């Protein structure tokens, strides 16, 4: 029917999701359960393991810790910046695959990404997280929740809110095919500040939302109304973003021993 067009959209987004992102929820979950036959992730649980894992994590930057002035908390924060920037680039490529997205006003393409990318980063981060820690560097690291908490303030506060969101969001038991449509719905949000032409964005999001509803009914026929819980999580994502921007506000002030990557500067300029 029209529901055929909706299956086509879901499959296209899935294909583009698999191509755009190096580590899927399926592979991440296997790694976190040892149900893979790959070399396990190097566990970072303290300052020593970080030093030993520095290489495999690709958090190396210019020089190793022991020959650089920058302290451990700053080096982890800088490591996570390079991972974010790559995430932003992967999400931008995925967005361009969303039918109608490249035909939008370029200024609106920028605004959607500007407000969208970190809501998608945190959604995708949950795929990599459990109550104990997070896969880093395409699954070859595992950094513990306790280690990230133990970092001296305000750095100890950055990742904990993402763990708290992830434990809840992971209970919905979404798979990659579900997440591929959900992240597209997030990108095509009509209510982002500074949007010039909301109508074609709401038209595209209407389609993605229908596609997400069909996908949820088919892939979870045992399950019932994720869709509603799942749409409430979109507001949770905005709160994580708000909170996170405040923490970046603090560190810009309390630390002058660091600067933000330019792309992250573009994104955070005039944001909540």
């Amino acid at each position: 029917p029209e529901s055929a067009d909706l299956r086509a959209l879901a499959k296209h987004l899935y294909d583009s999701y698999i191509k755009s992102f190096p580590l899927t929820k399926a592979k991440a979950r296997a790694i976190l359960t040892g149900k893979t036959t790959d070399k396990s992730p190097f566990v970072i649980y303290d300052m020593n393991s970080l030093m030993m894992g520095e290489d495999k994590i690709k958090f190396k930057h210019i020089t190793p810790l022991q020959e650089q002035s920058k302290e451990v908390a700053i080096r982890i924060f800088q490591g996570y910046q390079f991972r974010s920037v790559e995430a932003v680039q992967e999400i931008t490529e995925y967005a361009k695959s969303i039918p109608g997205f490249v035909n939008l006003d370029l200024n609106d393409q920028v605004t959607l990404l500007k407000y969208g990318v970190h809501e998608i980063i945190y959604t995708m981060l949950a795929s990599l997280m459990n109550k104990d820690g997070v896969l880093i560097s395409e699954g070859q690291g595992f950094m513990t929740r306790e280690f990230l908490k133990s970092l001296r303030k305000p750095f100890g506060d950055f990742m904990e809110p993402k763990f708290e969101f992830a434990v809840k969001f992971n209970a919905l038991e979404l798979d990659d095919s579900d997440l591929a449509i959900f992240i597209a719905v997030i990108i095509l949000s009509g209510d982002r500040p500074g949007l010039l032409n909301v109508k074609p964005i709401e038209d595209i999001q209407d389609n993605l939302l229908q596609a997400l509803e069909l996908q949820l009914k088919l892939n979870h026929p045992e399950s019932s109304q994720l869709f509603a819980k799942l749409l409430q999580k979109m507001t949770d994502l905005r709160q994580i973003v708000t909170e996170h921007v405040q923490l970046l506000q603090v560190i810009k002030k309390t630390e002058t021993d660091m600067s933000l990557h330019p792309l992250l500067q573009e994104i955070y300029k005039d944001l909540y």
Binding site: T92, V110, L113, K114, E266
Partner: peptide
């Protein structure tokens, strides 16, 4: 204004 974002998009 959003130089890198424009570049990533216009790629």
């Amino acid at each position: 204004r959003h130089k890198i974002l424009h570049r990533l998009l216009q790629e």
